[model samples]
Target chain A: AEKPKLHYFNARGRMESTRWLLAAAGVEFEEKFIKSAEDLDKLRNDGYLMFQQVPMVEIDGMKLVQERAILNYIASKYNLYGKDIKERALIDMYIEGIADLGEMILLLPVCPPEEKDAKLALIKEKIKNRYFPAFEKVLKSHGQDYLVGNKLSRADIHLVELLYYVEELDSSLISSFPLLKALKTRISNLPTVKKFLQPGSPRKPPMDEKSLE
Target chain B: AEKPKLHYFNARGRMESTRWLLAAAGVEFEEKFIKSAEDLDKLRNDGYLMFQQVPMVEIDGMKLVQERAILNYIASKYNLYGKDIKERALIDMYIEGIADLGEMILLLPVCPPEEKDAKLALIKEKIKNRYFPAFEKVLKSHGQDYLVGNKLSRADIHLVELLYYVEELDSSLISSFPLLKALKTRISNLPTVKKFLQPGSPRKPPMDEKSLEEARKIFRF
Candidate 1:
């Protein structure tokens, strides 16, 4: 079978999770980077173009929009969809919840200072109060190692990535939630996950803690 | 083997789309309506609770939040996902685009009259001018029947529903796009879609032109 082709404006934000999914699945594809406005304009004029945003993926002559949808597609295709229907739904909800959290954080960079403070505070409160308790419940219900199954699912990986992103954004934001902290640590230590976390891996961002701050 | 349970707050908002997907798939599920503040409070205290919003689906003991995610899950399970990878992506993109449009329509009921006019005008001009052309191009390329596959996908259903919502909200808002009008008509005439459109269907709001005008004014900008 032929490998699918993936194209997008060269950015690390929305596409990173999909990229990580494909890599973990051991899928191969062409990566086209639309770096400049001219590149975007040309791609837009191309017959297969879609989306008002970047990070669009083309697979086997088919184009998909929505980053999370693409992530879910790849997860499903690769047997990463979890063990059963209920587990898959849990994964879906968890990924969507994290995506919502990411959207909330995205508001921070554009919002006015006072509003930004309030938004960040709300986000922090949501994580500390709602998300932490919910995740703790999951861990307690299923044991600390896995989120949904005996093996790793995309949900675990995505949550691990999200926790890392949050910690990078503000470690103090998660300091009160020890269960979440431990879960993140466990996910980070997986052999496949550790490889992605290595210094020169494409998965690892080039930014330092100070840069993220 | 067993029917799923769905809990939602709104009758015809975000949650309705998911309900429609389940219905289209011929899946039987329970619909719990959260009508009042007390109902919401009671549900929140319940242990299996997830999500701060409604339109959540609980299938075989697991609760799934987020409308789009639920739709995607159903689509995957029912083989309603588009023909191939790209087609599936197009469905995803198109649904999100329609969702963006729905967000705009949702604002009309809450916006001031002047602001609503400004926003609606922008949507009419910019959306019809740029976006609809792109949409039409895709439809034309795909042989003018459905958005992706030869059969109905969630994208077509969503776009058609959104177009209906937009027209009912303000017919004049969508009057300029003949292709969109035709597309909406075509989808509405689908046999399954037509059956789904029966009176008293859950989430089928009374979205006639007059009520839409009234709603637009009620949500004056």
Candidate 2:
């Protein structure tokens, strides 16, 4: 409440994008992990909290929720939103682009274990034919620099996170997209983003789970 | 395609928000119904089109996909977005919240005649217990006149349309939200939207009021 504090489930899930934006902006913020069921209920009981989800940020005396909305807010303050209107629209386009892709991945139907392998195969092909080619082609067309206006934007952050998820689903998924590979590396190395990449900082699926992987 | 022609299904769907933004901004464009009559597959692979769904528009010298993307583009140009950044983010949050509610409604099974009422009851509970209370609180907190910036941004247009849809689903819906009622009419009476409302353009979509009372009458408000 005193400063920019992020309220989330302690895992760096969807909120990591906004966290990266804040880190990149070099702004100081406190991350409040929901430690108990009562805390979650408190957030749920706050009727004005329009989005009944977390990654909610109470900052500058205003309580903000919604992941992408919070991302846009932090990006607006940080220099990642866009350089102008067109860039902003393009940024918005990329944000939804990832969302659409993520939805398709989520749509993979749960099936019996015997059919699980086959379903996963079909899902992979669906993504391969339906989504990845477009991403690869767009990366190629964007000239290997940026998704919008040749400048870093929230689109880059979104794409980076999306690439992580897709690549996790298929190890060699992005192999052909050299430009995208390079772009992800560039973003990871940004001095501001190094804040979370540090050992003590939080990681999605958490460091312990990554060790299990 | 230079003047921002929107291509979608005959009835208003995802593209409705963008269409309202266009009207509120006084921007004119074509509305061809020849349709997804064309290959969306090829268009998906086409240069710079990084999206798969409709509610797509060709304008600002490039084809754009994503409903909110197009809305933001028009609002950014015509000042329907907001005066500045903070207002714009709040607007995005409200739009997403409404989108969440719509998603819930869309998931309700309207088929298989016997189960439809039961499914709709669940949607109402979600609307009453999960969705509507937050909206009422937000409207009350924002003081009822407008959703953000206290001005008639496209968020107002989105809300007005949504509130209408919610109320149409249940006649008693949103009856408790006094400020939301005011905001809906406030946007309808705005100077720029009047021409769009006149009966000269395309006709209005039919309101299925017959199903309004078809619910289990289980919602609180």
Candidate 3:
């Protein structure tokens, strides 16, 4: 099997989500780290990146750009999306909310030090009061092993990734979210994801000031 | 068929694209404009607005929130998305870029007057330099009537909408983009979109100082 070639800086930027989805799908990919800004420009000039952005993937005989578009293709091709249109729509909604939360966490390292503390506090509040509660209710109401269609889907995987990132904010973030706590445990232990979580895997360390810059 | 119900402000905020997509689909719908902040709160409190956001649509017996989700469902149902996965992905890519540009234009109305000109200049620069050139190349290379699959898809419709929004900044914005200018004229004459552009249609006027406050209050600016 031809491994997908990922083009991005060698850290968890928007590209990390692409990494996570591919890992979850049990697809091994190679990374082309952008060593400098000039490298990115060269890639753009060479016509590899369609939108002149990173998190681009060369797979299935196409160079796919846009994090969402790449993720959607991987999830759809790997059968992690859903069986039908309505199910896919639900997954998209859940993932969009999860992404909204994820973007806040993802941007924290790049945040100005003076603003970072206030931003982190707001993120924690939203997780507890807004985001986590909503997802917890969905799990409670559906009474299913997964977020949608009673099976593993992109929503569950993305939510688990977000759950882990939120825990890095505070270990007790999920204490009040019983359903979400269970979801994290369940999705984490999946064989593919478990392998991905192991030491020496391609998983990125938490972003730092140097890496962010 | 029962008409879809739209829930959002009276202004062409985030909901306007949803309105455009629905109209382009030739689907007639009703709007429940958020009258006050309490109304949005009540809608959220009643469990209709998931993620506590508007631009929600009740269509095909589902309450769809998230503007992209709503647009995706509408486009898919109406056959405005492409015929296959790869084609749909292309449409998604093009629309995402279009929406990126559209967002800059959409937020211009409420932009602090001091900052508005700077932001408008940036929008114009990006249109001329970055965005329009890419779409123009796509049009030139493919020689297609639409952005993806050569059929009237959501990407074309959304781009036309964005093209018009950019035009409002300066009517000459697309003058250098001959293909894009031609695209605006072509998509403008689509029967449903043409109808939508007519006066007395449900199309919203550009946001004003007064309406912006109402929107700001409802959305908590």
Candidate 4:
């Protein structure tokens, strides 16, 4: 069978997470970067990039939009999805939890610096109080190794990437949570992810002033 | 296996949509309501509710939160999701579209009456300019009979219910979209949904202004 070609605009945004998933799964496909507005325009006109969004995965000539949906599809195909319905729900909960946190972090760019401190402080409180504790309980319940039971799932990969990104973006923000810090370190040392730890490989980027905007 | 027992809180909020899905799927489940702070406190302490929110579905002893996630789970289990992957994505797109619109409409009650007119007007412009046109294009491409394909998937059912609630809440709001109006009527006539549509069958008391304010503060932010 022919491999599905995944074309996305060149950016480390929503699509990069799925790219990391594909890399972990060892899936091979063409990765096209739309470097210019002309390329994007041409693609849009051809209906290759519908909905005017990036991170679109074209499987067997059909275009799939929405980042999380694409991630779920890849996870389903690769058997990285949960073993059963309950586990799948847990995975969804974890993925959506990350998504909620990501959205909050994205707001830092739009908020004024004066407000950013207080806003991020509240946001960090929510993450520390609600999100991290919930995730910690899941990890602790499952023997403090995986987010789900036994084997590694997409949820684990996603959380690993998210925690890495959050730490790199603001180490001080997440330093207080010992379990979370340990989980990030554990995921960072995974053989597959270890390859990307070198100087040339794409490590998680920090959310700088320019990147935040 | 024993039939799953589902408990939903008072009023037709997000959970109501899931209840309607269960009803449409012919899935037998209990409907429990939490009407006040006391009821909510008890349910929260019980830990039966996922995320301490109403509209939770407990199936085979597991709790499910997130309204759309619950709907998707039920839809997939009952084969009401879609025929294939593409169809399923389309269904998701349509459902998400309605949800995005619903999120905006939900702010109407909270906006002050003086500002309400301007805010709702902008919302309506958005619907007319962006959403309705995009939906028309989708319907044109996929065919007007259903959102995905011939069968009535959860997206179609959700669209119908959303339109029904929107019309009842404010009919004039939806008067411009003729295709949507027709689609709503067609979905309402579905034998399953029609049977469940008793006068006050999906009943709830009038929205208390004070409680609505509190709900906006808690849920919307």
Write the residue-wise lDDT of candidate 3 on B74-184 in tens digits: 888899989988888888778888877887887777677899878878888888888888899889988888888879999999999888777777888788888898888
Question: Which tens-of-lDDT digit does each residue in A1-213 have in candidate 2?
Answer: 266888887665567777766776677778878877788879878642665677688866667888877877788877888788887877787778777776655444334678778867876775677566666667787575777777777777777777777777787877866777888888878886666567665445532323220
Docking class of 3: medium
Q: What i-RMS does each candidate reach, in Å? A: 2.8, 1.9, 1.0, 2.5
Give the residue spans of candidate 1 off by over 4 A.
A1-11, A26-32, A204-213, B1-5, B26-30, B58-62, B77-79, B82-87, B107-118, B172-180, B204-221
Model 3: residues with Cα > 4 Å off, grouped in runs: B110-117
lDDT of 3 by residue, A23-134 (tens): 9989888988898989999998998777678878888887888888888888988999999889988998899999889988888877889999999999989888889988
Among all windows of 10 consecutive residues in model 2 chain B, the one with the lowest summed lDDT is B212-221
- lDDT per residue as tens, model 1, A26-94: 676667776677777776677456645556677645567667667767877788888665677678777
Q: Higher-TM-score candidate among 2 and 4? A: 2
* Model 4 per-residue lDDT tens digits across residues A55-128: 67876556776676677677877878777767777777677777777778765667877888898788878777
What does candidate 2's lDDT look like per residue over B1-221, in tens digits? 26788765555556666766788777787875423324444454554345455667888786788877887788888887789888878887888788877765544433457878887887777777766776677777757577777677877787776776777689687777666677777777886677766677542463243332222121111
Candidate 3 Cα deviation (angstroms), residue B195 = 0.5
- As for DockQ, the candidate ahead, 3 or 4, is 3
Go through the candidates in order and give each one's C-alpha lDDT. Answer: 0.70, 0.70, 0.86, 0.70
TM-score of every model?
0.83, 0.84, 0.96, 0.83
In terms of lDDT, the best-performing candidate is: 3
How many angstroms is residue B218 displaced in model 1 relative to the true structure, after the best TM-score fit? 20
